[PDB]
Amino acid sequence: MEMEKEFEQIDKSGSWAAIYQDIRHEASDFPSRVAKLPKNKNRNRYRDVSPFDHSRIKLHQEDNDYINASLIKMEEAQRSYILTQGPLPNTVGHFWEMVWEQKSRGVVMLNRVMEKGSLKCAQYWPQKEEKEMIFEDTNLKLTLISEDIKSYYTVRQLELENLTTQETREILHFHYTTWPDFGVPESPASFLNFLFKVRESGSLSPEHGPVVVHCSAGIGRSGTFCLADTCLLLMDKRKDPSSVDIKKVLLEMRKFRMGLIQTADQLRFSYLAVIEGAKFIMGD
Numbered sequence: 124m125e126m127e128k129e130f131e132q133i134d135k136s137g138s139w140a141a142i143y144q145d146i147r148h149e150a151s152d153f154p155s156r157v158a159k160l161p162k163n164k165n166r167n168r169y170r171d172v173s174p175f176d177h178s179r180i181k182l183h184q185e186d187n188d189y190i191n192a193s194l195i196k197m198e199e200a201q202r203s204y205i206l207t208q209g210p211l212p213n214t215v216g217h218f219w220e221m222v223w224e225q226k227s228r229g230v231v232m233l234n235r236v237m238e239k240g241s242l243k244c245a246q247y248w249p250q251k252e253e254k255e256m257i258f259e260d261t262n263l264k265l266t267l268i269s270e271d272i273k274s275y276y277t278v279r280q281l282e283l284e285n286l287t288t289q290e291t292r293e294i295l296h297f298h299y300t301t302w303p304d305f306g307v308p309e310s311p312a313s314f315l316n317f318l319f320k321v322r323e324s325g326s327l328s329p330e331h332g333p334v335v336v337h338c339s340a341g342i343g344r345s346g347t348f349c350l351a352d353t354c355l356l357l358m359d360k361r362k363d364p365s366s367v368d369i370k371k372v373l374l375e376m377r378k379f380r381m382g383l384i385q386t387a388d389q390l391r392f393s394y395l396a397v398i399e400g401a402k403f404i405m406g407d
């Protein structure tokens with residue numbers, strides 16, 4: 124069923140809350156035993172958001188390999204994403220260790236450091252060129268190279284170098300700064316413009332490690348970004364683009380991380396974004 128007609132049918136019937144609860148009911152439940160070990164309590168931002176054991180990212184260290192981060196591997200679409208929480212004061216070094224070890228080119232940030240008057244993640248990147256950051260626990264140095272501030276978002280060029288050797292890779296940083304909590308972007312227009320800037324950078328392409336995507340919990344806004352990207356890629360690949368079922372793609376993605384899409388409004392906005400974005404994919 125053309126999603127655009129499925130969309131109008133749900134809107135006219137006002138059944139978004141009903142559709143959303145049906146997804147919640149059918150979603151995978153896998154163990155998260157490593158996340159719940161007492162040694163890891165200060166590595167989790169939210170008691171109720173944990174990576175499954177089968178899909179969690181492992182840090183390359185013998186001491187403690189745990190980070191709140193999941194590998195979402197889309198087979199039909201040939202895209203991978205790492206979804207993670209906003210870094211905590213004691214996990215900013217782990218965060219950059221993961222980017223290094225997984226060979227990522229891009230970090231996508233969908234939250235502000237402060238929202239609703241509370242801290243939603245650590246200030247984990249440098250704000251001035253001449254004030255670099257050193258992460259002593261993981262032996263990394265991070266330098267701001269350049270910053271491009273636009274109306275809806277900011278792009279930063281960062282230098283990451285192995286202080287174990289001398290390997291130097293440049294990481295890009297895509298910061299959406301207008302998205303509110305459990306809320307929706309302004310018009311899917313600015314969110315789609317942002318998604319197309321990440322794509323144009325190379326950050327989502329198979330010559331690199333998976334993109335790192337976060338918000339505060341790494342399930343709501345983060346979920347909306349990977350769901351919209353994968354659904355548009357499928358529409359581009361298939362003989363019949365009307366065969367793309369957004370609810371079925373979401374349930375596939377929920378095999379790899381719990382809770383993706385946090386509200387019925389986030390589900391509705393994901394539909395809107397894919398419907399408006401398809402008007403480019405199909406040749407306009």
Ligand SMILES: O=C(O)C1c2ccccc2Oc2ccccc21
Pocket residue numbers: 196197198199201202203329
């Ligand atoms: O499709 C593939 O060749 C491969 C893959 C194979 C089986 C299952 C999942 C899967 O995911 C991805 C994701 C990105 C790139 C390649 C793959």
